[PDB]
Amino acid sequence: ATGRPEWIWLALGTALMGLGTLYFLVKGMGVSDPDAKKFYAITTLVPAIAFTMYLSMLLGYGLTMVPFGGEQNPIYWARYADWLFTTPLLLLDLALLVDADQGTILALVGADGIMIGTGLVGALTKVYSYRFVWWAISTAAMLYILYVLFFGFTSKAESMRPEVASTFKVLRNVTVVLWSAYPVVWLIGSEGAGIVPLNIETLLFMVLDVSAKVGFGLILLRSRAIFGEAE
Numbered sequence: 001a002t003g004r005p006e007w008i009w010l011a012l013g014t015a016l017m018g019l020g021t022l023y024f025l026v027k028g029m030g031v032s033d034p035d036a037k038k039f040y041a042i043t044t045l046v047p048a049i050a051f052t053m054y055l056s057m058l059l060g061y062g063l064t065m066v067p068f069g070g071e072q073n074p075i076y077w078a079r080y081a082d083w084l085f086t087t088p089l090l091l092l093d094l095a096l097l098v099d100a101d102q103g104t105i106l107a108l109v110g111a112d113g114i115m116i117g118t119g120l121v122g123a124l125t126k127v128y129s130y131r132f133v134w135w136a137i138s139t140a141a142m143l144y145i146l147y148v149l150f151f152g153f154t155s156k157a158e159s160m161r162p163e164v165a166s167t168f169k170v171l172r173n174v175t176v177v178l179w180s181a182y183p184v185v186w187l188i189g190s191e192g193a194g195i196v197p198l199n200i201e202t203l204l205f206m207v208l209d210v211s212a213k214v215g216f217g218l219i220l221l222r223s224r225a226i227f228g229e230a231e
Ligand SMILES: CCCCCCCC/C=C\CCCCCCCC(=O)OC[C@H](O)CO
Pocket: 017, 018, 019, 021, 022, 025, 028, 031, 036, 037, 038, 040, 041, 042, 044, 045, 048, 051
């Protein structure tokens, strides 16, 4: 558990995802409105999955060594298993808020799976120059997602209840800003060019992970948008 200088950030991350899961679970009790239940279920699952994968990194299961640049490099592969299942759920929270059509949802979840799966391939690739080829396909998939969130969602939200429009626009903005930092941390951290050491990279991903999952949920689940309009 100790011996790895990043361990303090993995321990903190685990604690914050556990506490976030327990909070949403308790808040979610008794909610009867069928629409709100769907938002509670999706949004509580996100930190529950991330809690289990942070714990696996803490205990050292979610780590493997990958040779490249003539050295053995520690790669936390458990990050991608986490993101494979949590990032489509976050996009589903947004798409259900604006009642997106089924074709649009499919396009978003599919592009997201491509983004995370090519990120994983790049992380495990042993030929140094090819890691950046995968990084660029993965980043291209993420630019399609952000485009849909602005031209495919923002246009629909504005034709809906004001409480829905308002909450979507805050969540959309939060999403665009936090998600776009991820490819940058990868590129300058241990998986890429290696300018930032692993212990600081782990700190940066931990602040982004907690903000984009627990912070995101705090904003959505206090809104009136998730309830049906009723007397
Ligand atoms: C120290 C605490 C550690 C953190 C806890 C360990 C996390 C792993 C455990 C459990 C999964 C529990 C259920 C996760 C799914 C919750 C979904 C939900 O609550 O949905 C409510 C909805 O309203 C219903 O219809």
